[PDB]
Structures are given as C-alpha cells and as structure tokens.
Structure 1
Amino acid sequence: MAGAQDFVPHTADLAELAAAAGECRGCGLYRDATQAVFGAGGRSARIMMIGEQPGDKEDLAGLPFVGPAGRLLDRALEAADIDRDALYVTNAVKHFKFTRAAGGKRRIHKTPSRTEVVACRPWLIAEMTSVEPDVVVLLGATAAKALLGNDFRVTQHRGEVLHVDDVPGDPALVATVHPSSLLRGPKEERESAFAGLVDDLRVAADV
C-alpha cells in the first residue's frame, strides 16, 4: 500500500504538514473522526514523543495528549524536570479510531491495525524530517512497533537506549509504557509503573 504517502507535501514546515494531514485519506480512519490531530511543539525540539492516536478529548481539541492520559504524562514530565513546551509531541496514527458502547461516558478508542500504522507512518517520517530530534520517546506498544517492528515488546526493553538505521537522523529511541496504562489498576502497580515512566523519561533527557 501507498498509504498516506500521496497526501504528504514536499515541505518541512509543520503548519503546512498539519494542514495537509487534514486532507489525508491514506486509510479509512479520516471518515468517522472529527479532524486529523497533528503534533504540537516546534522544530527546535530535541525530544520527540509519539503516542498511539488521538483519543476522545484530542479528536475535538485538535491537540495531542489533552485528556487523562495527557495529565498523567504531564505529572511524569514534571517529575522528570522536562518542560512540555520544549518537546514535539505527536502520535503514530493521526485520526481517532473508535466506537461507542451503550451507557458509555465517552468514545472508546480501538487499536489501529498494523496496516493503519504503516499507512500513517509517512506523516511520522515527515515530522521527524522536519524536527530532526536527538531522541524519540515511544509511548506504548503501537508507537514503539511503528519504528522498531511489529514484533517489538515494549515491556522487555524498558529504559534501554535503542537505535535503528531505518529512522531519520539516527536519533536514539526510548520505548516506554503508555501513560493511559497507568490510569487504572492496583495502587502499588500504578505507582511502580509511574516511577519507571519517570526513569525512562530521564534516560531520554540525558542522551
């Protein structure tokens, strides 16, 4: 598949890239979503962070990581002494994939297929080309697999500094737990997992 490639313009300007993502039809996810959600921040960023996809909040705000997972993430960044205004924050897939359940308090996100990730990956390539980050934080399974391969296991490479040639700039790559995984479950387990997120964020910051 060609995917998003036909829709990515020959430019490194983020505002231009964001606009053209708004017209992307490189998989079927544009149809039900409200709008594309491009990355936030600037091309001076040293650290890029990539999540899975916009959720419910993000689909309507037009910005990444503005819901509960994003508030958790801010708490982690803060403890790692990282200013979020200095990052470029984005997602592997740029349109919200979702459903609704009866009695639901919100739209429930559905995991992008590997095919959708590969379809949308040209946007990530363009973002990386535009920003030239020194390090990329891969937030959770989908984002990590997008760069590291569909077989990659986030849980097994926590806190490791990774590199593949496959990527623009040969930044270091640090794969970590998705902040939404820390929202729920037993208290000791959340707190432990949170401490590891802070650690992995510091690994990325010290590259």
Structure 2
Amino acid sequence: MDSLEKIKEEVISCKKCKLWQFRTNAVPGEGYPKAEIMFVGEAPGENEDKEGRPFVGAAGKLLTQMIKEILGLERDQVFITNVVKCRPPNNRDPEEDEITACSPYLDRQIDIIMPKIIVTLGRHSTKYIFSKMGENFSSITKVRGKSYVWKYKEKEIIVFPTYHPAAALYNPNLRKILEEDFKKIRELAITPKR
C-alpha cells in the first residue's frame, strides 16, 4: 500500500538518480494530506537542501506570503513539493533523466492527495504536469494565468500554471502578475464546482 509517509521515507534515502551524491537532505515535500491546493515547484535550492523542506529560501518566503495574504492559508493547510526532490549541483536545472527518475514520487503524491487544484510554479513543473494531462505545452509565458481541467481517476483536478516565485523576487511587474494569478487561484478554491 502507498502513503505520503512511505514516499517520504523512500525519498529521504533515495539514490535513484545522480543527484543524491550532492545533497545534504532530500526534500519530499510537506503539508496536509487532504490539501485542496497542491503547489509544485522545480527542485530544491540551497536552503531547501540544508533544511530538508521545500520553499524556505527567499523565493519560498515570498510563496508563503502569497499563500497567506492572498489565498488566506497557512502552509500546513496546503501541500508543497517539487517535480525533482534533490538540489541539482551548480545552480542548474534538473536533467531530463533526473525528472524521469524522480517524477514517479510526485505522481504517487498526487494519487494520494487528489487535490482540487494543482498550482504549477514555473516551467518545469508546468511542462511535467501538462505531459501527464496530455495538454499541449508551448511556454510558461503562453500558458500561465488560467486554469486547465485535468480529468484524473474519479475526479477533476484544476491545474493552474504560474511564474515561479523566484522570478518575482526582483521584478515588481512580474510579482504583480503572480499576485493576480494567486487571486484567481483563490477564486477557484472558494467557488463550488457547478
């Protein structure tokens, strides 16, 4: 049987791709197992690696602030993870073989949580989830800021791509766009399906 607990244990000791050799801590993700909103980023950065926790550096602090101020939620009420769960070396993005190796953990996490909404933060997570959906992916610029319905198992999941929070740290305009995207996510979260 599968569980978020089992996945967490596996990730923490995982050596299924070459990223394990560099890490201090793998980062399985954290949050409410019955979260209505699931956030998926790219991969851990430096502070995430040090702490074993997703989105805790500057970009993460911005994410937390938007979740709190715009969605009206604490981190413990949502679920937050990444498509790749170890920090790639040298500030680089995950290789495709690393996404291929690690993404079954995310698949398993989604299978268990079955959130109402998945917010895909940035191009890597958006491209990955679009591939599972069978939704055409052009670029994050072209696809962000609206919802995509993912018929999955017995339910529908609303997928909402946004820019990654890191992109909003030093760009006032991009930040405003991300905030507006989170306002739209709030409306989707509080509105009953009809």
The TM tier, using the shorter chain, reads 0.7 to 0.9
* Amino acid in the other structure paired with 2:190: D
- Find the counterpart in structure 2 of residue 37 from structure 1: 27
- Counterpart CA distance in 2 for 1:136 and 1:148 is 11
| Aligned counterpart, 2:81 | 90
Q: What SS does structure 1 have at the residue aligned with 2:170?
A: coil
Cα distance per residue 1:178-204 (max 9 Å; x no partner): 00001124x4x2443343343343244
Alpha-carbon spacing, 1:195–1:44, altered in 2? closer, same or farther (3 Å) = closer
How far is the alpha carbon of 1:24 from its aligned partner? 1.9
Aligned length: 186
Residue deviations 1:5-34 (CA, integer Å, cap 9, x gap): xxxxx412x222111112222211111111
Q: Equivalents in 2 of 1:32, 1:147: separation in Å?
A: 26
- 8 Å CA contact retained: 1:136, 1:204: no
* 3-state DSSP of counterpart to 2:54: coil
Distance of 1:20 and 1:41 partners within structure 2: 17
Q: What is residue 17 of structure 1 aligned with on the other side?
A: 7
Deviation at 1:124, TM superposition (A): 0.4
Residue 141 (1) aligns with residue 123 (2):
yes
- Poorly superposed stretches of 4+, deviation over 4 Å: 165-169
- 5+ long unaligned stretches in structure 1: 1-9, 100-108
Is contact 2:29-2:79 (8 Å) kept? Answer: yes
**Percent identity for Structure 1 against Structure 2:** 29
Counterparts of 2:14 and 2:188, CA distance in 1:
31
1:1-207 correspondence runs (5 A) = 10-12=1-3, 14-80=4-70, 81-99=72-90, 109-149=91-131, 151-165=137-151, 169-185=155-171, 187=172, 189-206=173-190
Alpha-carbon RMSD: 2.1
SS in 1 for 2:119: strand
| Structure-1 separation of matches of 2:130 and 2:121 | 12
| CA offsets 1:148-201 (integer angstroms, 9 cap, x no match) | 13944221123211124478853111001100001124x4x2443343343343
Which whole-Å CA distance do the structure 1 matches of 2:65 and 2:181 have between them?
Answer: 10
Are residues 180 and 194 of structure 1, via their aligned partners in 2, closer, same or farther at CA, if it must alter by over 3 Å? same
Where structure 2 has 5 or more consecutive residues not aligned to the other structure, the ranges are none
Which deviates more from structure 2 when the two are superposed, residues 113-122 or residues 167-176? 167-176
TM-score of the aligned structures, taking structure 1 as reference length: 0.81
Change (3 A) 1:168 1:117: farther
Q: Are the equivalent residues in 2 in contact too, given 1:163–1:171 (CA < 8 A)?
A: yes
Please state which structure has a larger fraction of its residues in helix: 2
**SS at 1:89's partner residue?**
strand
